[PDB]
Structure formats: structure tokens, C-alpha cells
Design an enzyme around this catalytic site. Structure first.
Site, PDB file in Angstrom:
ATOM      1  N   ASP A 259       0.833  -1.199   0.000  1.00 23.74           N
ATOM      2  CA  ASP A 259       0.000   0.000   0.000  1.00 23.74           C
ATOM      3  C   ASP A 259       0.872   1.254   0.000  1.00 23.74           C
ATOM      4  OD1 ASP A 259      -1.913   1.918   0.301  1.00 23.74           O
ATOM      5  OD2 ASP A 259      -2.421   1.394   2.383  1.00 23.74           O
TER       6      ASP A 259
ATOM      7  N   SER B  43      -0.799  15.623 -11.903  1.00 20.29           N
ATOM      8  CA  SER B  43      -1.060  15.286 -13.288  1.00 20.29           C
ATOM      9  C   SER B  43      -1.316  16.548 -14.102  1.00 20.29           C
ATOM     10  CB  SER B  43      -2.275  14.356 -13.359  1.00 20.29           C
ATOM     11  OG  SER B  43      -2.673  14.104 -14.684  1.00 20.29           O
TER      12      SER B  43
END
EC number: 3.4.23.22
Length: 330
Positions: A35, A199
């Protein structure tokens, strides 16, 4: 040194991925959920409340000659999905894919929430976010990667998650045969303890790319892609019959639909998520309403590039003094 381990989807939907991890001496192999959005290595154990164990493999520290109780240390964690767990702490030897760390903090669960009990395929978590998020008290502990990184050939790990297929976590090296084209690297902020990046925009299907900054985290422990409501609305508007269902808890769509791809930007590069990766199947067995793999982050507080996004790429978690993230197509 290096390590390399296969990671395998737990079910036919790729809801999560499990990777075998050797703990203790002799080794006890548990299948852990790696994770990158958390920083605790915790396991089902011989100390877990018996009614809360249902099929998981447990770590028994009393059978490990290298286990040592970390005196006074406790841990307690709550994840973004509402689940939680807590317990005490041992140090022990932990190996992943041939890479060994001695003295790793292994957090032994005394209690786990129902969602963990109900998932017999996941024996615990191995956190790969920054150690500043580790929950051990009163002395915070380091992640497996943090403990290993001085010994690694290069201070990196990579995630290559499969679509409906096994993939690979590598430590200490970048397998140049595992991706196409080049890897585009992008800046990371560690201020929140996550692999947080920006992004450069998105496209829906064959539509034009929208240049817009989207801050979010690269999180292998989250199944879906959680993005701003504007972006998610633009995606599902291209699927006839798709709608946001308050009762179901997100966007659903007719199972008969063909889904468009979703592209996200990494600098000037583009990662394309095929439409099929966005189908999470019937909302309940036999239903013709299917659950979407792109969902709004509006109620989270952060955008999350979960498995839906990451499995479309070869992802480099660069733990150099100034960390960065790399993405390549594959």
C-alpha cells in the site's frame, strides 16, 4: 541488493493485489497488500481476537526465533475506506522477493475491523508511503522500504500491476524490459506523507486533451481512480445511461455499455487507461447495473490515482533524497 516479487489480484475484479512476504525465522509467509498510501506493516497474528480471524494466515511471533517484542509500542490505524486495526509491535526479519530487512517493525493486530475479517485473502498490509505516516507510538517506526533503501542498488521500488493478471513489485532496480517507450518523471510533495504529484490533465476516449493540474496521490492500496467531480462527470457523460447513484455510492452504468478509455497526463506524456479497466462489474450479483472505476473525490479531500490508473503504467517510486515518481506505458 534487490528484490522482486509477484503480486496477484485477490479476485476477478482486481479489487486488491497480494504479495507474499516472509516474516520471522523460520519464515512464516503471509500474503500482504502493498500500500503506497500508508506506512504500517501490520499482520493478522496469533494475538488477533479469534472471532475476527476468518481464513487469514497469521503471524505467530512466539514461533519466530528472531522476533522481539518492541516494549511499550502500540499502533492503531484508520484507512480512507472506514476500516481500521490496532495492536502491539514486534521487530523481526522480513523478506520480500529475496530482499531481507532485519529489525523490521511488524505490527501485530489485536483487533481488525469487519472488512479485514471478511477478506480471507489479505493477511495484512505492507505500507510504502513515507515513514512520517507510521502510526506506532510512542516511537514511530520505519517502513520496509525506508529500512531497505540504503542497501538497495538504487533507492527505488517499482509497481507493475496487472489487469486481470499477476504483476510485479521490484525493489532496488528498474526492469527496462517491463515497459515501452521512456519513463517520465514528475515531482513529488511529501508534505502529507504520500507519493503526491500533479497530473497535467486528462482526455476521455478519443476526445481532446484538457490541460489542467490535478494534484493527487499514487496509491496502490486504493482500488479505484478518484478525481474531481468535473472530470468524473465529463467521463461518465460519454457512457449512455451512466449516472451517479447516491444509494449505491457512486457512478453506475449499464453492464451492456462499452466504456471509453481515460487518459491522464504525466508531464508531456500520456497514460491511457483502457475502458475495460474501468468496469467493476455488477453492483450486486445478477444486476445489470455495473459499478464504475472512476469516481468523484469530492468527499475524500484528495484525488487518488489508485489501481485503476496505476495498473495502466509501469510506476517508479524514486526514494532519492528528493523523491520523484516515474510513469511509463507498458
Amino acid at each position: 541488493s534487490t528484490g522482486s516479487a509477484t503480486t496477484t489480484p485477490i479476485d476477478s475484479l482486481d479489487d486488491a493485489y497480494i504479495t507474499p512476504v516472509q516474516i520471522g525465522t523460520p519464515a512464516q509467509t503471509l500474503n500482504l497488500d502493498f500500500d503506497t498510501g500508508s506506512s504500517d506493516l501490520w499482520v493478522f497474528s496469533s494475538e488477533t481476537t479469534a472471532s475476527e480471524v476468518d481464513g487469514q494466515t497469521i503471524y505467530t511471533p512466539s514461533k519466530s526465533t528472531t522476533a522481539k517484542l518492541l516494549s511499550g509500542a502500540t499502533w492503531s490505524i484508520s484507512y480512507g475506506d472506514g476500516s481500521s486495526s490496532s495492536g502491539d509491535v514486534y521487530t523481526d526479519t522480513v523478506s520480500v522477493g529475496g530482499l531481507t530487512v532485519t529489525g523490521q517493525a511488524v505490527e501485530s493486530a489485536k483487533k481488525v475491523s469487519s472488512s479485514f475479517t471478511e477478506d480471507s485473502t489479505i493477511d495484512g498490509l505492507l505500507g510504502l508511503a513515507f515513514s512520517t505516516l507510521n502510526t506506532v507510538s510512542p516511537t514511530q517506526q520505519k517502513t520496509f522500504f525506508d529500512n531497505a533503501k540504503a542497501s538497495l542498488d538504487s533507492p527505488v521500488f517499482t509497481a507493475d500491476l496487472g489487469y486481470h493478471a499477476p504483476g510485479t513489485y521490484n525493489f532496488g532496480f528498474i526492469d527496462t524490459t517491463a515497459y515501452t517507450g521512456s519513463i517520465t518523471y514528475t515531482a513529488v510533495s511529501t508534505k502529507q506523507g504520500f507519493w503526491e504529484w500533479t497530473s497535467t490533465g486528462y482526455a476521455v476516449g478519443s476526445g481532446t486533451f484538457k490541460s489542467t493540474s490535478i494534484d493527487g496521490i499514487a496509491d496502490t492500496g486504493t482500488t479505484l481512480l478518484y478525481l474531481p467531480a468535473t472530470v468524473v462527470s465529463a467521463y461518465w457523460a460519454q457512457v449512455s445511461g451512466a449516472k451517479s447513484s447516491s444509494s449505491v455510492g457512486g457512478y453506475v452504468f449499464p453492464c451492456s455499455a462499452t466504456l471509453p478509455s481515460f487518459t491522464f497526463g504525466v508531464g508531456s506524456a500520456r497514460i491511457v487507461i483502457p475502458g475495460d479497466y474501468i468496469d467493476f462489474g455488477p453492483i450486486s450479483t445478477g444486476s445489470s447495473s455495473c459499478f464504475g472505476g472512476i469516481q468523484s473525490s469530492a468527499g475524500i479531500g484528495i484525488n487518488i490515482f489508485g489501481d485503476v490508473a496505476l495498473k495502466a503504467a509501469f510506476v517508479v517510486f524514486n526514494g532519492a533524497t528528493t523523491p520523484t515518481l516515474g510513469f511509463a506505458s507498458k
